[PDB]
Amino acid sequence: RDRKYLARLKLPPLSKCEALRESLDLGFEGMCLEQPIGKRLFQQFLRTHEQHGPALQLWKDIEDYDTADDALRPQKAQALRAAYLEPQAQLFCSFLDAETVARARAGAGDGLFQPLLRAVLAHLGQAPFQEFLDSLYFLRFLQWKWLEAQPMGEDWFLDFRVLGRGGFGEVFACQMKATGKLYACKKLNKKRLKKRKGYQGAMVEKKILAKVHSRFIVSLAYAFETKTDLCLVMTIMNGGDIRYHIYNVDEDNPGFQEPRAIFYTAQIVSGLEHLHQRNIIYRDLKPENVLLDDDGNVRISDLGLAVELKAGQTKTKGYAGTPGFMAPELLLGEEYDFSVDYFALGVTLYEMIAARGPFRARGEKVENKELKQRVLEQAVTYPDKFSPASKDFCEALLQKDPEKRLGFRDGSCDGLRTHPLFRDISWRQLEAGMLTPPFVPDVKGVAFEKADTEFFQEFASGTCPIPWQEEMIETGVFGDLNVWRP
Amino acid sequence: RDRKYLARLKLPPLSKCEALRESLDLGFEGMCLEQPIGKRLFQQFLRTHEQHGPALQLWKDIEDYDTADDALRPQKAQALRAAYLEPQAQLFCSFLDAETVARARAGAGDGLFQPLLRAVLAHLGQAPFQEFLDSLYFLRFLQWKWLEAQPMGEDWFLDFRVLGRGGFGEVFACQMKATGKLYACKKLNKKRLKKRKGYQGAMVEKKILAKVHSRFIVSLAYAFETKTDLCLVMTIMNGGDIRYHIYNVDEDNPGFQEPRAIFYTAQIVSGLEHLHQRNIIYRDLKPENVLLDDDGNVRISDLGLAVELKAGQTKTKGYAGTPGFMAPELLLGEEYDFSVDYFALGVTLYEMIAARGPFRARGEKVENKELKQRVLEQAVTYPDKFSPASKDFCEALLQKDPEKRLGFRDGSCDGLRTHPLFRDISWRQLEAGMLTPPFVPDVKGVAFEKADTEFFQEFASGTCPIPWQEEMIETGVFGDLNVWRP
Ligand SMILES: Nc1ncnc2c1ncn2[C@@H]1O[C@H](COP(=O)(O)OP(=O)(O)O)[C@@H](O)[C@H]1O
Ligand SMILES: Nc1ncnc2c1ncn2[C@@H]1O[C@H](COP(=O)(O)OP(=O)(O)O)[C@@H](O)[C@H]1O
Ligand SMILES: [Mg+2]
Ligand SMILES: [Mg+2]
Ligand SMILES: [Mg+2]
Ligand SMILES: [Mg+2]
């Protein structure tokens, strides 16, 4: 971990933060719930003001309950009602209207104290937040926000191994010099990008990865440019992709035992739900695009083919994707939904179990025209490796007509999580990354004009707030720079 | 210690401090050296900024040297030159011009690193201070300054014993309810004060005690008013006055053994020097006005007869004082100096040793006219209880002609500290209250008009900055209210 760079992270004089005190969203949930550092500084304020003690403690306890092993839930719920909900107890929460306290008292299932937590946060967003804004803790948040906006480009990162190769350049495992955090840096050589008309794709990816924060999508931390390249510094995923893992590990016995395959399906499904909730269509889901991190958790990646539906827009058109994964509606030149992605999910689960595609034989290579016809009118065949459940799930995803295809209804995939295939999957624990993964790894003549440079600048948009604050915190740097009296 | 009142000490929202951010002196030495809390907060800033580390540590070390037992001085000076003055050492102070470093390197006596310290503080007053002002630490100082200005009057103090009786009311030992700190509250019934024309005297005292900060003058902490009284909350002195101690403890063998008497004289002399340095003439020094605290240290008190010389004024006129202590020049109706006080010092040391006055016999009571003549023309007589030194000192203070009287020359009493009488007195340790004391204890028809109410308001000027910050600190309240992360 480089000391010269560590030393460039130093909180500024308050006078330097006056400007970005206007260019900043004051919004409560925006800054105190979503930004890791704001949340940390706002909980600190709370901890040092008696009045708010109970609310802070309840809040903290709820998140503790939401992350507890199922075994400990009953008692944590017990102590929680005892500690904040009996009008006796010291930490009773008088700001909770009795109707809310009643419900919280009578415990349902998963989502038990969710409506409690919403009431607590609704409370904190009023005076407590308004007080925070009038406290030193808020001024500290502005200092941090200032350091976050400072330039941290190429000289800040040390490449030290190739993770893979891609259309426009290599992908390196690299270190952020100050903090020593490990990332993946994806390079896109500038000249090739122009030569091959790939600006739209490159940008769609950067914007998606920046504005999306899921443990199942790879996450963008930084975006800058060099003499030669555009760069995307993002979550490092060191455990190879699903497709590698299907064919290349167990060579003579290709495939996944159902449970493992289901685990991934479940994680991937969570990846889609997030994209679709933000009106994004992936358009490119497949084994080769799904990566494993060191622990054996999985994230979707590679998003050059994605599209963002403009607000109010529900359907779109356009040929795009990988042959053998594009769904019927797309091929028929029709306008399509998120449904497209679910068809791809199905092809994917299928491949994970059968170590082969549904639409061709091993080595069988056909013309596009023919592959198209198979996808459109060929009924899929399910060998014995499949279990009733698997088979049925794949049938529901691979439904030729999107109107009849298992997918995304009512702003979620809840309908889908229901399926008998996910019988042994605790969605709570999965969504929170707290389940044990079933498997743990071990050119000539281009001239740059005005429009080219503009594009580059718009691409190199600098640091991504949430992931940077995460890094500062995980890496210890926040604790160190934040001390008041040593 | 009262919890209801403790709870009224809570730092305010920054917005409430905007106003007193103009009505405040920014001055460096004024806020960071003289105000205990500003100093504490400014050292905190310093501790949390690497660059300033060396300067802060030097500063701290010097005060440590200035308070060390004489036994430890040599080595502390050693480690000090080793740690900040050799260009090698980590904590070397590059901001010290070499000429200063040279002098500091070659050690004299008492006052060794004084000119070093002045250079360190001169440094801190520049950028470091200017940075402080742009830091959160300065904003915290504004919060504290806000709490300090909040109303803390009679309901904030619990009387619980009479310490003594005075012309206009009693003096009580009382507790500051919030902090539990013990004070003396001196009451002046409002009606009597008016009836007997005592407003000037009462005020002269309050202003003197407020604007003066010495360990040898009693110290004013608060000044407020009740329905019936004006109030002065001040240092508590529980060990009786010198005059009580002269006659009333050892009844049949009245007096002080020289060393004890010298100790007091030395303390008292320090009391005068402060008063004179601020152009104040005491006019009322005497055994009955000199108090003992619990440890047996001594402070001068009772200041209704004092006068403050307007700036540029060097001499004054006016009959005032206690018969038997007023000096010749004063009696002769002439205009007088601080010299007056030194004559009183002399009568005082004399009484401490002889258990009698120099000018009359036991029980001898004469007319003013006669007592005057004795003071003016009677030569003093020194029994055997006196040592050459004592006798000589008293002769020098009791000199009828102020032009020839030992006293206050060149802005100090250094000339006087020189005397052979103080041969065994370490002035350094005395001035710092770190010596072991030789003895350790165990009405009708008055109507209030406009002018009366105005006077009262001007008198009840509230809390005294320095002593309040001291209290907050000693009493632990500052530590508690100042925490950043618990
Ligand atoms: N976040 C990452 N962590 C580790 N390796 C990666 C990461 N992203 C990509 N790679 C490696 O780089 C390859 C190409 O990256 P990708 O973004 O898929 O390029 P393209 O979009 O040009 O196909 C991947 O197959 C993978 O092996
Ligand atoms: N700070 C104090 N601590 C303890 N006792 C005190 C203090 N101030 C006054 N007293 C007691 O109360 C008496 C009267 O106080 P004083 O200020 O001398 O009033 P006055 O000016 O009317 O003489 C003193 O003689 C002393 O015994
Ligand atoms: Mg790829
Ligand atoms: Mg791509
Ligand atoms: Mg008195
Ligand atoms: Mg008086």
Coordinates of N, CA and C and ligand atoms in Angstrom, one line a residue, chain B residues 163-168 171 184 186 205 218 234-237 288 291 302, ligand 2:
Chain B
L163 N -19.8 31.4 55.2 CA -18.4 31.4 55.3 C -17.9 32.6 56.1
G164 N -18.8 33.5 56.3 CA -18.5 34.8 56.9 C -19.5 35.9 56.7
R165 N -19.3 37.0 57.4 CA -20.3 38.1 57.3 C -19.6 39.4 56.8
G166 N -20.3 40.2 56.0 CA -19.7 41.4 55.5 C -20.7 42.5 55.5
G167 N -20.2 43.7 55.3 CA -21.1 44.9 55.4 C -22.4 44.8 54.7
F168 N -22.6 44.2 53.6 CA -23.9 44.2 53.0 C -24.6 42.9 52.9
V171 N -21.7 35.8 53.2 CA -21.0 35.1 52.2 C -21.2 33.6 52.5
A184 N -17.7 30.4 46.5 CA -18.1 31.3 47.6 C -19.1 32.3 46.9
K186 N -20.9 35.8 47.5 CA -21.0 36.9 48.4 C -22.2 37.8 48.0
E205 N -15.1 46.5 42.9 CA -14.7 45.2 43.3 C -15.0 44.2 42.2
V218 N -8.5 36.4 44.7 CA -9.7 35.5 44.6 C -10.3 35.8 43.2
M234 N -17.3 33.4 43.5 CA -15.9 33.5 43.4 C -15.2 32.4 44.0
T235 N -13.9 32.2 43.7 CA -13.0 31.2 44.4 C -13.4 31.1 45.9
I236 N -13.6 29.8 46.3 CA -13.8 29.6 47.7 C -12.5 29.5 48.4
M237 N -12.4 30.2 49.6 CA -11.2 30.1 50.4 C -11.6 29.8 51.8
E288 N -6.6 40.6 57.7 CA -8.0 40.2 57.7 C -8.6 40.0 56.3
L291 N -6.9 35.7 52.5 CA -7.5 34.4 52.8 C -6.7 33.1 52.5
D302 N -11.4 41.2 49.0 CA -12.0 42.4 49.5 C -11.4 43.7 48.7
Ligands
LIG2 N1 -14.0 34.1 48.7 C1 -14.3 33.8 50.0 N2 -14.1 32.6 50.6 C2 -14.4 32.3 51.8 N3 -14.8 33.2 52.7 C3 -15.0 34.5 52.3 C4 -14.7 34.9 50.9 N4 -15.0 36.2 50.8 C5 -15.4 36.6 52.0 N5 -15.4 35.6 52.9 C6 -15.8 35.8 54.3 O1 -16.8 36.8 54.4 C7 -16.3 38.0 55.0 C8 -16.9 39.2 54.3 O2 -16.5 39.3 52.9 P1 -15.9 40.6 52.3 O3 -15.7 40.5 50.8 O4 -14.6 41.0 53.1 O5 -17.1 41.7 52.6 P2 -16.8 43.3 52.9 O6 -16.3 43.9 51.6 O7 -18.2 43.8 53.2 O8 -15.9 43.2 54.0 C9 -14.8 37.9 55.0 O9 -14.3 38.5 56.2 C10 -14.6 36.4 55.0 O10 -14.5 35.9 56.3

